[PDB]
Design a protein around this motif. Structure first.
Motif, mmCIF file in Angstrom:
data_model
loop_
_atom_site.group_PDB
_atom_site.id
_atom_site.type_symbol
_atom_site.label_atom_id
_atom_site.label_comp_id
_atom_site.label_asym_id
_atom_site.label_seq_id
_atom_site.Cartn_x
_atom_site.Cartn_y
_atom_site.Cartn_z
ATOM 1 N N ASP A 148 19.037 63.263 13.248
ATOM 2 C CA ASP A 148 20.375 63.639 14.097
ATOM 3 C C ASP A 148 20.398 65.141 14.579
ATOM 4 O OD1 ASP A 148 23.221 62.097 13.401
ATOM 5 O OD2 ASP A 148 23.460 64.244 13.378
ATOM 6 N N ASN A 167 21.472 65.555 17.701
ATOM 7 C CA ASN A 167 22.540 65.435 18.495
ATOM 8 C C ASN A 167 23.815 65.821 17.593
ATOM 9 O OD1 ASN A 167 22.484 63.236 17.075
ATOM 10 N ND2 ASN A 167 23.064 61.934 18.708
ATOM 11 N N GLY A 168 23.840 65.160 16.343
ATOM 12 C CA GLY A 168 25.027 65.206 15.644
ATOM 13 C C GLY A 168 25.420 63.958 15.261
ATOM 14 N N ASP A 169 26.716 63.993 15.145
ATOM 15 C CA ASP A 169 27.652 62.671 15.005
ATOM 16 C C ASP A 169 27.353 62.327 13.260
ATOM 17 O OD1 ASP A 169 27.267 62.627 17.609
ATOM 18 O OD2 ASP A 169 25.520 61.406 17.737
ATOM 19 N N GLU A 229 24.734 60.603 11.933
ATOM 20 C CA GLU A 229 24.351 59.407 11.953
ATOM 21 C C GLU A 229 23.315 59.040 12.988
ATOM 22 O OE1 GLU A 229 27.657 56.675 12.557
ATOM 23 O OE2 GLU A 229 28.221 57.971 14.296
ATOM 24 N N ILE A 230 22.346 58.043 12.632
ATOM 25 C CA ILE A 230 21.127 57.821 13.645
ATOM 26 C C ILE A 230 21.501 56.712 14.480
ATOM 27 C CG2 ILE A 230 19.035 57.741 14.088
ATOM 28 C CD1 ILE A 230 18.490 59.291 11.507
ATOM 29 N N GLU A 252 18.942 57.201 19.295
ATOM 30 C CA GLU A 252 18.663 58.576 18.720
ATOM 31 C C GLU A 252 17.237 58.443 18.235
ATOM 32 O OE1 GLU A 252 21.847 60.207 16.188
ATOM 33 O OE2 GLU A 252 23.198 58.631 16.963
HETATM 34 CA CA LIG Z 1 23.232 61.186 16.085
#
Ligand SMILES: [Ca+2]
Ligand SMILES: [Ca+2]
Length: 70
Positions: free
Chosen positions: A15, A17-19, A21-22, A26
């Motif tokens: 993760d 990038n963030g969020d 979550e995958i 991703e």
């Molecule tokens: Ca992500």
């Protein structure tokens, strides 16, 4: 205390990038690094299914741990 530490560390890796979550795009970006480099040959659509065994279509913190477990 020795356990969840390195656990949350691996989660962040994917993760990046963030969020928090995958997604399918991703984990895919990580698969290339794990394997090496692949210009073509598409077959990740299968790996995502193995991880996305929750039907949610995504991977959270809890699901991540279960995935690592046999
Ligand atoms: Ca992500
Ligand atoms: Ca899932």
């Amino acid at each position: 205390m020795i356990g969840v530490k390195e656990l949350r560390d691996a989660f962040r890796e994917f993760d990046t990038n963030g969020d928090g979550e995958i997604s399918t795009s991703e984990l895919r970006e990580a698969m290339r690094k794990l394997l090496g480099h692949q210009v073509g040959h598409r077959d990740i659509e299968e790996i995502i299914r193995d991880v996305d065994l929750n039907g949610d279509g995504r991977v959270d913190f809890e699901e991540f741990v279960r995935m690592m477990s046999r």
